[PDB]
Amino acid sequence: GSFVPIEKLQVNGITMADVKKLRESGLHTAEAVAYAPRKDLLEIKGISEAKADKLLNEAARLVPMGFVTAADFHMRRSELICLTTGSKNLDTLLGGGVETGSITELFGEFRTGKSQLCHTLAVTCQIPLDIGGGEGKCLYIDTEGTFRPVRLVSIAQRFGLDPDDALNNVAYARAYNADHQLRLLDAAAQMMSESRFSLIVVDSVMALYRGELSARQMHLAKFMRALQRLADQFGVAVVVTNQVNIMAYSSTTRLGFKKGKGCQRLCKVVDSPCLPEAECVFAIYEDGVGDPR
Ligand SMILES: [Cl-]
Ligand SMILES: [Cl-]
Ligand SMILES: [Cl-]
């Protein structure tokens, strides 16, 4: 578990009925309750101002909300799960792999390995922590109708998983428009509180554009917040592709992809608040992302 069950707040007066309203308002985790703005709670038909306090205080008991030393914070970060990309080179570039808790943006032109990396991740997020996995399910939001379950079979076997189980562990959803894409997230909160997910994939967030450009950006920004909110509330890793700034601001780790020779691909760290601006070379294989021969 990478988040505190909201049911743990049903004490000292908090009822199942109270939590029921919280869930209904979209809070399915203690962290969610802990990170919710007081105003949001108060505007919930049924929650008293004195009750909101009860909730906040209780949640704050289960979820850290105070100060700690930068030294301590460093330690905690070093404990974050980093999902393996399947490539030693790439994992090294990312200081271990895809960092859970924030958004990693995969950008570049079509056929640069972005989608392939997502297919691999959809599987490695399911494997044992001991081997760079997240022992959790994957929420896969596809806006281009390019996801292909069959590609995951070969990948699962490569990691010793039973293909049937691997495909069963991926909650797939095709989004047809921005409002739909955003609507899918609300349902994801519910699912994630019912089964352990370790990763959310959105290929690609830029579909958000298909005079009113300002409206597009405002929608894109709202979607990215929702994604980061889910990362905070459930402690999962989030990867988003971007076919080719709201993205530079929202994304934590931004990786640029270019096509290399043959099945080889290049990946450069474009933005990161802690990773050095370096680049590596990885490859694409019938059984997922790996390192060059
Ligand atoms: Cl750090
Ligand atoms: Cl490719
Ligand atoms: Cl790609």
Side-chain angles (χ1 to χ4, degrees), residues 185-243:
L185 288 190
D186 303 298
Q190 260 290 326
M191 284 173 260
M192 297 189 271
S193 67
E194 293 172 359
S195 315
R196 176 186 163 58
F197 278 76
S198 53
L199 167 74
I200 297 186
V201 172
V202 184
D203 186 341
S204 51
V205 312
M206 213 50 256
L208 246 303
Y209 83 88
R210 290 174 184 177
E212 62 188 306
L213 185 288
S214 55
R216 258 55 177 295
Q217 297 189 180
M218 185 173 94
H219 214 297
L220 170 55
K222 178 172 184 175
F223 184 71
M224 293 298 285
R225 304 186 194 306
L227 287 177
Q228 184 50 55
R229 210 156 62 224
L230 288 178
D232 301 317
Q233 296 180 166
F234 295 88
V236 296
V238 176
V239 168
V240 307
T241 61
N242 183 27
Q243 315 296 324

Side-chain angles (χ1 to χ4, degrees), residues 63-74:
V63 176
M65 295 287 284
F67 285 87
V68 303
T69 59
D72 284 357
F73 181 50
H74 184 185

Side-chain angles (χ1 to χ4, degrees), residues 76-268:
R76 254 60 206 304
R77 279 185 51 61
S78 77
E79 297 170 0
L80 285 173
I81 302 303
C82 292
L83 303 172
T84 183
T85 67
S87 157
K88 291 176 174 300
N89 292 37
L90 214 52
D91 290 354
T92 276
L93 198 68
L94 301 173
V98 181
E99 203 179 79
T100 88
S102 60
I103 300 168
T104 291
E105 177 194 329
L106 310 182
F107 85 72
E109 300 179 318
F110 161 81
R111 202 172 188 57
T112 50
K114 300 186 294 77
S115 168
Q116 284 292 174
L117 179 56
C118 284
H119 280 76
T120 304
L121 288 175
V123 173
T124 59
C125 69
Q126 307 186 40
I127 77 179
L129 296 183
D130 65 356
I131 57 176
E135 289 169 52
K137 291 184 189 180
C138 169
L139 187 89
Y140 205 114
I141 292 177
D142 172 33
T143 67
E144 300 176 0
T146 62
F147 181 67
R148 291 288 179 291
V150 67
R151 282 238 282 93
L152 274 56
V153 172
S154 179
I155 306 183
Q157 308 174 311
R158 163 194 179 181
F159 292 99
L161 303 187
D162 158 55
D164 293 306
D165 292 351
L167 296 184
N168 276 304
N169 286 333
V170 178
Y172 173 77
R174 164 63 183 289
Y176 296 85
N177 62 70
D179 311 287
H180 181 202
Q181 184 173 312
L182 195 51
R183 213 181 311 151
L184 294 161
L185 288 190
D186 303 298
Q190 260 290 326
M191 284 173 260
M192 297 189 271
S193 67
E194 293 172 359
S195 315
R196 176 186 163 58
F197 278 76
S198 53
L199 167 74
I200 297 186
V201 172
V202 184
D203 186 341
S204 51
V205 312
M206 213 50 256
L208 246 303
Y209 83 88
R210 290 174 184 177
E212 62 188 306
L213 185 288
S214 55
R216 258 55 177 295
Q217 297 189 180
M218 185 173 94
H219 214 297
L220 170 55
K222 178 172 184 175
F223 184 71
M224 293 298 285
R225 304 186 194 306
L227 287 177
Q228 184 50 55
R229 210 156 62 224
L230 288 178
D232 301 317
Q233 296 180 166
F234 295 88
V236 296
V238 176
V239 168
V240 307
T241 61
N242 183 27
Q243 315 296 324
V244 287
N245 188 173
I246 299 67
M247 292 307 284
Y249 178 93
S250 306
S251 296
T252 285
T253 307
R254 309 184 69 250
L255 307 175
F257 292 67
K258 286 176 184 171
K259 186 176 292 176
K261 259 55 197 62
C263 59
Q264 290 194 173
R265 301 284 179 288
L266 307 176
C267 175
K268 181 197 303 295

